[PDB]
Write a protein that binds this ligand. Sequence first.
Ligand SMILES: [Ca+2]
Ligand SMILES: [Ca+2]
Ligand SMILES: [Ca+2]
Ligand SMILES: [Ca+2]
Lengths: 174, 173
Amino acid sequence: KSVVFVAIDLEAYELDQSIITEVGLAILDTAEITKNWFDFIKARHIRVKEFSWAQEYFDFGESEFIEVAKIASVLKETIEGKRPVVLVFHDQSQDLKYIRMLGYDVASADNILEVVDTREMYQYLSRSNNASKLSNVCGYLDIPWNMHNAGNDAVYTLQAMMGLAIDMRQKSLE
Amino acid sequence: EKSVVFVAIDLEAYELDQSIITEVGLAILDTAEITKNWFDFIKARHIRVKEFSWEYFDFGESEFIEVAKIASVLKETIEAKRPVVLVFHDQSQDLKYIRMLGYDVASADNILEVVDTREMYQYLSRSNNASKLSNVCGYLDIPWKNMHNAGNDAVYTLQAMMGLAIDMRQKSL
Ligand SMILES: [Ca+2]
Ligand SMILES: [Ca+2]
Ligand SMILES: [Ca+2]
Ligand SMILES: [Ca+2]
């Protein structure tokens, strides 16, 4: 049994929302660990080569430059290669729009097992005691985070959910 | 430079006698050490408690320390100076064990926050997205060896909360 976790983030130009400028991908193939999960996270930052003027580096690899016409096939290869895929988003509606605008048809993919939106879970956690504590500590620290990079955005999203999922599982078995 | 020390703790008691402490798990993250990537700066310790001085641990080598010295080890870890965030799973049980070792963590005045993941997971039990992850992990049924190891238990606890806290912060900005 194997599942491919795919975290995705896309950015659009501030002054022209029809222009998609970067794609962040963070992949975790459980088949590659079936024992230290975060070492097996494959991250990619894709800068749209036609729109690199439309305006941070990539902290988990080297940023790629790809033409807009080639982006869709890259996304299709990532998601469809068919092995079951779990999509992880923050703000699912916004990112699904951006993916469509790049020429990829998510609906065509028959191998999507689940879609996870952290924006829902974090909203849900907004009235959580322990979650609020963590926020206060991070708010106190005011840590300055390279920060708009879609590649980083996707990695942090995947690490957060995988770390949470693994822990909840292990603690439930004991 | 403002800094906080995150300390994840797990203790284990003997199966047949909950008065006998057998293991202590510590996972430390000093934010001052990042002010690479955050999880690379996590310092883990596994202590098997020997009663007298004359599975495995996947994040280092297990230490052997006598019961009489454990309290000071914990106190040194927590304490005094810099603010400490305590991270537990089942806070009451672990605080009990520590007290029985002669150290009163609650007495420590440098405690900024105390986080109990067992509460959050209870709260997340009726979460839509959390349930999705659970079903996938239940299907995969990935076998993690040495899951009862108190050292590993603390590392997974800290990684889960730090990864969650960092992400929640960045996405809110
Ligand atoms: Ca984005
Ligand atoms: Ca997003
Ligand atoms: Ca324990
Ligand atoms: Ca515990």
